């Protein structure tokens, strides 16, 4: 469960055998983010520091920081893949709200036009693009937070 | 003023016309940090995002993230200049506690590394001149280890 700031695996609701992964786990900025096989213990490129940057409780905004690279999960365009570019912590496209979907959460960009984290094509297999796409109350837009 | 998380200029108590500045303001990792003139408006390399990563109130730990580069203020050595390298957010050397320098007030603070032995954010040699090195140095809560958080 999401209990505020901390380190987490972020796991797609339709495919809990997978997690959110910065592709190839390199220190170069700009990796795209996809679902990937979890393993028994997650790799640091598949662990994320949720870091509070504004507000609290209902008004909390967070950076979602890759543990390996230190880069921030960012939406660039609606219905396009998310990535971890080098970006200012004050850029709203790198800021997210984490809200109960109805346990299970949506991850919503501070720029409302950019939407929420969404697994492309409702995939349940490793290597699926994770998009920022407009909210549709769909199961591929729901996520678990597993504290690590 | 400090309210926990936020974007700030971090201003040394002895030299309030200066702030904490990532030297040269480039995007490459590894800038050292010095004091530098505030100016009429802050440059982005002299703005810092305080981001909560663990705990709360008394047990709060923060990243202090450069606004321009997104790299984290880090202590690398005892009594040595601080820097903004590329580093994991879970690395204790990049994590800080921000504590009132004296009780019964909420305006002057110490900035304390999570690695105890790395100490406090310190203006070298009590300098009041622009361009002074900012160190992680032995923690004494001296006046060169006290800081204000200014923010619009």
Q: How far is CA B79 from CA A53, B117, B135, B139, in A?
A: 30, 10, 6, 10
Domain B1-152 listed as CATH 3.50.50.60: no
- HSE-CB at B102 with a 13 A cutoff on CA atoms is 8
In sequence order, the 6+-apart residues with CB closer than 8 A to the CB of A45 are A21, A22, A24, A25, A31, A66, A67, A68, A69
Q: Give the closest of A6, A68, A89 to B51, CB-based.
A: A89
Distance from CA of B6 to the nearest CA of A (A): 6
| Inter-chain residue contact B71 with A70, CB threshold 8 Å | yes
CA distance A34 to A26: 14
Query: Residue A55 region, left (φ>0) first, then alpha (ψ -120 to 50), else beta?
Result: left
Strand, helix or coil at A27? coil
Nearest Cα residue in chain A from B51: A53
Interface A–B counts its CB contacts (< 8 A) at: 61
DSSP E strands in chain A: the ranges are 6-12, 18-22, 31-37, 48-54, 61-66, 80-81, 83-84, 96-100, 105-109, 116-119, 130-133, 143-147
CB contact under 8 A, B70 and A87: yes
Sequence ranges of the domains in chain A = 1-148
| A1-148 fold | Trefoil (Acidic Fibroblast Growth Factor, subunit A) (2.80.10)
**Encoded tokens for B58:** 């008394």
Residue A67, chain B, CB below 8 Å: the answer is yes
For the CA atoms of A121, A122, A126, A129, the dihedral, rounded to the nearest 10 degrees, stands at 50
SS (H, E, C) chain B: CCCCCEEEEEEECCCCCEEEEECCCCCCCCEEEEEEECCCCCCHHHCEEEEEEECCHHHCEEEEEECCCCCECECCCCCEECEECCCCCCCHHHCEEEEECCCCCCCCEEEEECCHHHCEEEEHHHCCCCCCEEEEECCCCCHHHCEEEECC
Which residues on A lie below 8 Å from B69 (Cβ)? 86
Strand partners, A36: A19
Residue B74 touches chain A, beta carbons under 8 Å: no
Residue A25, number of CB atoms within 10 A of its CB? 15
Residues of A in contact with B6 (CB under 8 A): 53-54
Chain A closest CA to B61's CA: distance in Å?
10
The residue of chain A nearest to residue B69, with distances taken between CA atoms, is A88
End-to-end CA distance of chain B: 9
Provide the 3-class DSSP secondary structure of residue A72.
strand
Residues of chain B contacting residue A87, judged by C-beta atoms under 8 Å apart:
70
Resolution of the determined structure in angstroms stands at 1.6
């Amino acid at each position: 469960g999401f209990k505020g700031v901390g380190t987490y695996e972020i796991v797609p609701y339709q495919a809990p055998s997978l997690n959110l992964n910065a592709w190839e786990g390199k220190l170069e900025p700009g990796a795209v983010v996809r679902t990937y096989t979890r393993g028994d213990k997650p790799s640091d490129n598949a662990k994320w520091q949720v870091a509070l940057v504004a507000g609290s409780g209902d008004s909390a905004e967070y950076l979602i920081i890759n543990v390996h690279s230190g880069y921030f999960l960012t939406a660039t365009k609606e219905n396009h893949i998310v990535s971890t570019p080098q970006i200012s912590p004050t850029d709203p496209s790198a800021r997210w709200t984490i809200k109960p979907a109805t346990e299970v959460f949506t991850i919503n960009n501070k720029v409302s036009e950019l939407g929420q984290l969404t697994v492309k094509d409702y995939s349940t297999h490793s290597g699926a693009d994770v998009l920022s796409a407009s909210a549709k109350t769909a199961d591929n837009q729901k996520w678990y937070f597993d504290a690590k």
